[PDB]
Write a protein that binds this ligand. Structure first.
Ligand SMILES: COCCc1ccc(CCCCCN2C[C@H](O)[C@@H](O)[C@H](O)[C@H]2CO)cc1
Length: 765
C-alpha cells in the first residue's frame, strides 16, 4: 500500500507547468523529455520585436505584474500577466486530465486582450515552442493541406519510452489574422499560422530565444538575397513570419500573428488514455478546477478575524497560489568544489584569506545529473531551490496537500551525498546556470543552511499522531504509509544531524571555556569579514573579526530543532538506542545555550568569540539572532529567560516596529548600516516563527500567557496588514519590509516565504 500510493502520486504529479523561470511552459517530472514554452511580442517596426518579445521572467517598468490566481499542481490553474510594454493582458489556463498509463493529458488556453492604451490594430507575434530530448524518441508536425501554412490546427505526433505515444495540438484560435498584399505573399502566403521543425543537439534545446532568432534572421537574410528591399518592403509582421517547413525534429516552432485580441488552445493527448482531449474538455476541466480550488481554500485557509473579509480572501488566494505555483522541476549537473581543501577547515585566525586562496585554485567541476522538484523564492530573480527557504515554503503547502510536501522533501533528501551534505542552492542544468554568474555557481560541501525542513516534518508528525482529494492526504489517513515514509527518510535525517556535528562544530576544549557539556558548541562554516551567508541572515552583525573561536547561537538552536524531531520520529520507529542518545544531546544543548550564549547583562542570547586575550567574550547584537532559542521552540514556557525575551520583542525602542519585528535593534550600532539586508528590515519568515511561538505560549497555563497573547494578537495584525497593504498598492509580495515606512523593498515576486502570511491569517496553529 506504500508502493501503491507512491505510484499514484507519481502518476498524479508527473505533468505540470513546471518551468517557473519562464512566464508559461510545461515539462513533466522527467529529466530528458518533452517541454513547451510560450513567447509573445508586439511588432510595430523592423527592429522592435527583438526587444518586445517575452519569454523568461523579469520584473521591470515594462511589466505591471503577473502570477497565478489559482493553482493546484494536481489539477492546474489560471495565470494572469499584465504587460505594459506589449499593451497586453494575458491569461494562461492550464489543466490536467488523468487517464492512460503515462501521467495523463493536459490542455492550456492562451488568451491575450489588448489593454486600453494599446493600438486597436496592434500586431502581436505569438510563438509556441516545443522541444524533445532523448535518443529514442520522435516528434513530427503533420503537414497542412494549404501551400504556405495552416488554415486550422497544427498537429504534432510524438513518441518516447517515457510518454509512450502522444499528440500535441495547437488549435487555430480566435483572432483577426493580418493579410499582406505584398509581392512576397506569392511566395510566403498572405499570412497564416506556420511551423518550423528543426534538430539541434539535445543539450541546447532549452535555448528557445536564440534558436528562434536564428530562424527569423535566416528568413530576413533570404528576403535580402531574393531582392526584397526598402524600395518596397513587406510589412514588419510579415518580415518576421517564418517560412513554413513542418516535418520531424526535436524542435518545433509554431507561430501565429494576431491583429487585435486573440486566443488559442494547446491540447496534449496521451494516446494510452481515453479519447483525445478537445477544447470543450479544456473549458469544462478549467471550471471544475476552480470550484475545487475554491472549496479547498475555504477549508484549508479559513482566515480568522480580523481577516475574514473578502479583500483578505483575495489576498490570501494570491499569496498562496503564487507560492505553490512556483513549483518547478529542474534537471542536470551542478558546480561543486570536491577538493575538500584543508583551508576550508577554517581552523586559523584569518581563515577567510586562506579559503579565498583555495577557491582561487578553481577545482570545482560539474557533477550529476541531479533532479529536484521544489518551490522557489523568486520567478524573476532566483527561480531555484534554496534549502532553508523550502522549510518555509512547505509550511502552507503541507496544509494544502501534505503528500505534495512529502514529495518535495523526499526530492530534496535524494540530493544528499554520502557525507550528509545538501548544497544550500540548487543550480541544476545549463538552463538554470544561464541565470547565475559563473562566479556564484559553485557549491561547497562545508556550507550548511538552517535545517528548516525539519519544521515541516515536525508538523507532519503531529498530524500523524492525531481521488485528488484522497491522494493529497493519503500519507496521514493511512498510518502505515506515513510511518514507512519516515522509516525510509529517518536514516538521512540522522545522517544530516551527524553531518552538522561533524562539519559545523565549535571549539570548547581548546580555550578557557567551561560549560555543562564539552560536546555542544556550533559555528557556521563559510563566514567572511562582513557576511555569514550559510546562516540565512546574510549581513546580520557577527563577532569581529570572525574567528575559529566563534560560537553562533542560531546554529545551536537549529541543532536543537533537529534533535527534537529525531526524538519524535525515532520514537515512532522505536530506535531506542538512538532516542537515548538524542535525549542526552538535547539536555546538553539546553544547558549549553545558557552557559555559552546567555547574557545576564543584556537579557538575551548572544553569539560568542574569544578575546584578544584568548578568553570567551559574549557579543550582543539585539535582533533576530538574539531570540533564536525562543524562535525555534527550545525554551520552557515558565523560563525567566523567555519572559526577558518577551520584553525585548515587545519593546518598540529595540525591535518592535508598527510593521513587524525589526531584524536588528534601532539601538544596535550596526542598525541600518552597510547593505542593510538583515540589519533593520522586517522579514516575514522570522516574524512567522515569532508569531507561532507567541501563540504557543498564549494557549497554555503559565506566567507569560497573557503578555504573549497580547503580542501574538498585535504582531499577527502588524505582519498581515503590512504585507497586505503592500499587495494592494503594488500587486507584489516583497522580500522584506521597511521598518520605518512599512514599504516593501528589495525583490518583488517573492513567493517566497512572504506567502507564510496565508498561514498567519488562518491561525489555530
Ligand atoms: C534587480 O534584482 C537583483 C537581482 C539578484 C538576484 C539574485 C541574487 C543572488 C541570490 C539571492 C538570495 C536571496 N536570498 C537571500 C536571503 O538572505 C536568504 O536567507 C535566502 O536563502 C535567499 C533566497 O531566498 C542577487 C541579486
Amino acid at each position: 500500500l506504500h508502493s501503491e500510493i507512491g505510484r499514484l502520486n507519481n502518476q498524479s504529479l508527473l505533468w505540470g507547468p513546471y518551468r517557473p523561470n519562464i512566464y508559461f511552459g510545461t515539462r513533466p517530472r522527467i529529466g530528458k523529455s518533452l517541454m513547451t514554452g510560450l513567447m509573445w511580442g508586439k511588432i510595430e517596426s523592423y527592429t522592435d520585436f527583438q526587444h518586445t518579445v517575452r519569454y523568461t521572467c523579469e520584473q521591470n517598468e515594462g511589466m505591471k505584474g503577473y502570477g497565478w490566481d489559482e493553482y493546484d499542481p494536481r489539477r492546474g490553474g489560471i495565470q494572469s500577466i499584465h504587460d505594459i510594454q506589449n499593451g497586453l493582458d494575458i491569461t494562461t489556463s492550464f489543466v490536467k486530465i488523468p487517464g492512460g498509463a503515462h501521467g495523463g493529458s493536459w490542455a492550456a488556453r492562451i488568451k491575450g486582450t489588448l489593454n486600453d492604451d494599446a493600438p486597436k490594430d496592434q500586431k502581436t507575434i505569438v510563438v509556441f515552442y516545443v522541444s524533445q530530448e532523448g535518443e529514442n524518441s520522435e516528434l513530427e508536425a503533420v503537414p497542412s493541406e494549404n501551400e504556405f501554412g495552416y488554415e486550422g490546427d497544427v498537429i504534432l505526433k510524438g513518441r518516447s519510452e517515457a510518454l509512450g505515444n502522444y499528440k500535441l495540438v495547437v488549435t487555430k484560435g480566435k483572432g483577426v489574422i493580418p493579410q499582406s498584399d505584398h509581392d512576397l505573399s506569392r511566395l510566403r502566403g498572405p499570412g497564416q499560422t506556420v511551423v518550423q521543425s528543426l534538430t539541434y543537439p539535445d543539450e541546447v534545446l532549452w535555448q528557445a530565444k536564440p534558436i528562434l532568432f536564428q530562424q527569423l534572421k535566416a528568413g530576413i537574410d533570404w528576403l535580402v538575397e531574393n531582392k526584397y528591399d526598402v524600395a518596397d518592403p513587406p510589412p514588419p509582421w510579415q518580415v518576421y513570419l517564418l517560412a513554413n517547413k513542418p516535418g520531424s525534429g526535436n524542435v518545433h516552432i509554431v507561430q501565429k500573428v494576431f491583429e487585435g485580441d486573440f486566443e488559442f488552445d494547446i491540447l496534449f493527448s496521451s494516446e494510452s488514455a481515453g479519447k483525445e482531449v478537445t477544447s470543450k474538455d479544456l473549458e469544462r476541466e478549467v471550471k471544475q478546477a476552480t470550484e475545487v480550488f475554491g472549496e479547498r481554500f475555504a477549508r484549508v485557509f479559513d482566515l480568522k478575524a480580523p481577516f475574514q473579509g473578502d479583500n483578505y480572501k483575495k489576498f490570501g488566494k494570491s499569496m498562496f497560489s503564487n507560492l505553490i505555483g512556483g513549483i518547478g522541476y529542474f534537471y542536470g549537473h551542478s558546480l561543486v568544489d570536491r577538493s575538500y581543501a584543508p583551508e576550508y577547515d577554517e581552523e586559523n585566525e584569518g581563515f577567510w584569506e586562506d579559503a579565498a586562496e583555495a577557491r582561487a585554485r578553481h577545482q570545482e567541476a560539474l557533477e550529476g545529473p541531479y533532479e529536484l522538484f521544489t518551490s522557489i523564492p523568486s520567478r524573476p530573480f532566483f527561480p531555484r531551490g534554496f534549502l532553508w527557504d523550502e522549510g518555509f515554503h512547505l509550511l502552507p503547502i503541507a496544509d494544502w496537500d501534505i503528500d505534495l510536501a512529502l514529495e518535495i522533501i523526499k526530492s530534496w533528501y535524494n540530493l544528499m551525498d554520502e557525507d550528509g551534505w545538501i548544497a544550500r542552492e540548487q543550480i541544476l542544468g545549463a538552463e538554470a546556470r544561464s541565470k547565475v554568474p559563473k562566479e556564484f555557481q559553485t557549491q561547497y560541501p562545508h556550507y550548511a543552511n538552517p535545517p528548516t525542513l525539519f519544521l515541516v516534518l515536525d508538523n507532519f508528525v503531529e498530524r500523524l499522531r492525531k481521488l485528488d482529494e484522497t491522494l493529497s492526504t493519503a500519507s496521514v489517513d493511512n498510518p502505515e504509509v506515513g510511518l514507512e515514509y519516515l522509516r525510509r527518510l529517518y536514516p538521512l535525517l540522522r545522517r544530516q544531524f551527524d553531518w552538522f556535528r561533524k562539519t559545523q562544530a565549535g571549539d570548547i576544549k581548546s580555550y578557557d571555556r567551561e560549560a555543562y557539556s564539552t560536546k555542544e558548541a556550533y559555528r557556521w562554516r563559510g563566514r567572511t569579514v562582513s557576511h555569514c551567508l550559510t546562516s540565512g541572515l546574510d549581513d546580520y552583525p557577527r563577532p569581529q573579526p570572525p574567528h575559529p573561536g566563534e560560537l553562533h547561537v542560531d546554529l545551536m538552536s537549529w541543532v536543537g530543532v533537529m534533535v527534537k524531531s529525531l526524538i519524535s520520529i525515532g520514537s515512532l520507529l522505536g530506535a531506542t538506542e538512538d532516542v537515548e542518545f538524542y535525549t542526552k544531546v538535547l539536555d546538553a544543548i539546553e544547558h549549553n545555550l545558557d552557559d555559552l550564549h546567555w547574557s545576564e547583562k543584556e537579557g538575551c542570547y548572544c553569539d560568542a568569540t574569544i578575546d584578544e586575550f584568548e578568553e570567551h567574550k559574549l557579543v550582543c547584537h539585539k535582533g533576530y539572532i538574539s531570540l533564536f532559542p525562543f524562535l525555534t521552540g527550545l525554551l520552557k514556557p515558565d523560563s525567566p529567560k523567555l519572559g526577558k525575551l518577551l520584553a525585548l520583542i515587545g519593546d518598540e525602542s529595540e525591535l518592535w516596529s508598527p510593521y513587524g519585528l525589526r531584524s536588528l535593534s534601532k539601538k544596535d550600532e550596526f542598525y541600518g548600516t552597510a547593505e542593510n539586508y538583515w540589519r533593520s528590515p522586517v522579514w516575514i519568515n522570522i516574524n512567522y516563527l515569532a508569531i507561532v511561538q507567541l501563540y504557543n505560549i498564549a494557549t497554555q497555563d503559565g506566567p507569560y500567557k497573557e503578555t504573549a497573547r497580547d503580542l501574538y494578537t498585535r504582531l499577527r495584525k502588524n505582519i498581515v496588514e503590512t504585507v497586505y497593504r503592500n499587495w494592494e498598492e503594488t500587486g507584489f509580495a516583497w522580500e522584506q519590509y521597511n521598518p520605518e515606512t512599512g514599504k516593501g523593498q528589495r525583490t518583488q515576486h517573492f513567493t517566497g516565504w512572504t506567502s507564510l502570511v496565508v498561514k498567519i491569517m488562518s491561525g489555530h496553529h
